[PDB]
């Protein structure tokens, strides 16, 4: 379809900073709106709608509608690691409603006290296979995916160790080759300077 | 309750027929049904009022066949699949407008079900270095080989499945990206505290459900058929 138009980012907001999601729509006869959130494993959940011009506020949520310049838009205020998701803009056209491809938002985790390491892990089973475990790194250091096909590297990932209060990102690599070492493991990519790689 | 739609995933070769099945929310007049692609919206295909169907999208090519014949549950039809025809198909019911979505049928359209491969598993055990330097213990998982990419990846200590201090990656990658019925793999970390890891009676079991072959799928094979099935790998906690 061409009458819902976003960007499909990805977008990137520091956590508890406000996130800004915008979409236009090509006919003005267009009148009911929506926002759904899609988890990535997920079915699209509505989250908000407007029918009117003007401001609409839920929670942490503000959805706008603006008529003359043809936008709607979605403000996340506080964002937390559960808003990241695809939030997909709709309108509705007659009875059905149509979707936009969705802008995917990821929350960066706030990391107090990063500690960029690159450690190996051998199988708990045959301890001859192993893997490269790149953790601890800050929320906006980028993973650069392998142009080696015989290298496998896995985007980062936020976990929460809600007991103890403490998130961290990480990513793995690992190879068909098991002479393949982690110090040139994320070398592709360009991680801290000072990470540590112990011996 | 809720919207409810069955199967959750079908596999299918190539040229075969397939039916998928939609239980809209009872009190909704309205039933819709969408394809939807990663990176990509929910695309329309049709739209039931009642048991009218009342608006079809170039979308609902000649092969597709929506029915809703008592105004209530709906079926989808596909015939003769093709490969462009892999994607999840999401139901949905409305009372007026808004639309409410079942969990979809995530349907993978393969040349040969011989290109079918359930997961391997493998647990990968904290690094000493990580111990030492940090005082946590992370446990990696990995999943390998499998076809088609729906799997669901969990952690199990002591028995009881974990959520805190987990991260699993949000898509499998492929194996072979330039090859169109490529094998998938997936990762996933677990942290827990040192002391944690190192008292030896703590069980971890990395468990991957995947969704293959049914029962009535004509295996012409023999290495084992690939139903769905779990697949795991565990590890014991050491004391240094």
């Known amino acids: 379809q061409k009458e819902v138009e976003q960007n499909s980012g990805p977008l990137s907001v520091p956590e508890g900073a406000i996130a800004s999601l915008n979409c236009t729509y090509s006919d003005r006869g267009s009148q009911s709106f929506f926002w759904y959130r899609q988890y990535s494993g997920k079915s699209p959940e509505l989250i908000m709608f407007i029918y009117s011009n003007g401001d609409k506020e839920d929670g942490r949520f503000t959805a706008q509608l603006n008529k003359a310049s043809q936008y709607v838009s979605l403000l996340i205020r506080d964002s937390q690691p559960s808003d990241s998701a695809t939030y997909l803009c709709?309108?509705?056209?007659?009875?059905?409603?149509?979707f936009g491809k969705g802008t995917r938002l990821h929350i960066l985790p706030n990391i107090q006290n990063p500690d960029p390491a690159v450690y190996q892990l051998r199988d708990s089973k045959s301890s001859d296979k192993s893997v490269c475990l790149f953790t601890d790194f800050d929320s906006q250091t980028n993973v650069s995916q392998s142009k080696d096909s015989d290298v496998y590297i896995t985007d980062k990932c936020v976990l929460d160790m809600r007991s103890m209060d403490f998130k961290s990102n990480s990513a793995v690599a690992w190879s068909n080759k098991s002479d393949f070492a982690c110090a040139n493991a994320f070398n592709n990519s360009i991680i801290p300077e000072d990470t540590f790689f112990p011996s | 309750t809720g919207v409810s739609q069955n199967p959750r995933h079908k596999i299918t070769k190539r040229g075969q027929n397939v039916t998928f099945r939609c239980d809209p929310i009872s009190e909704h007049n309205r039933l819709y049904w969408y394809r939807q692609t990663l990176g990509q919206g929910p695309e329309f295909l049709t739209y039931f009022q009642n048991e009218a169907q009342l608006e079809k999208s170039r979308l609902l090519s000649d092969r597709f066949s929506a029915e809703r014949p008592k105004g209530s549950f709906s079926t989808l039809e596909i015939q003769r699949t093709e490969q462009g025809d892999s994607a999840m198909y999401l139901c949905?019911?409305?009372?007026?407008?808004?639309?409410?979505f079942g969990p979809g049928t995530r349907l993978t359209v393969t040349e040969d079900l011989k290109n079918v491969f359930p997961p391997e598993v493998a647990v990968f055990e904290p690094s000493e270095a990580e111990i030492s330097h940090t005082q946590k213990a992370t446990l990696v998982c990995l999943a390998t080989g499998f076809y088609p990419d729906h799997v669901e990846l969990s952690w199990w200590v002591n028995g009881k499945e974990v959520h805190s201090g987990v991260c699993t990656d949000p898509q499998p990658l492929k194996e072979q990206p330039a090859l169109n019925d490529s094998r998938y793999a997936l990762s996933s970390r677990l942290r827990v505290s040192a002391t944690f890891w190192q008292n030896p009676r703590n069980h971890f079991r990395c468990q991957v459900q995947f969704y293959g072959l049914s029962e009535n799928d004509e295996w012409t094979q023999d290495r084992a058929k690939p139903v769905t099935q779990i697949v795991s790998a565990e590890a014991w906690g050491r004391a240094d």
């Open positions: 949905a019911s409305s009372p007026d407008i808004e639309q409410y």
């Open positions: 709709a309108v509705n056209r007659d009875d059905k409603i149509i």
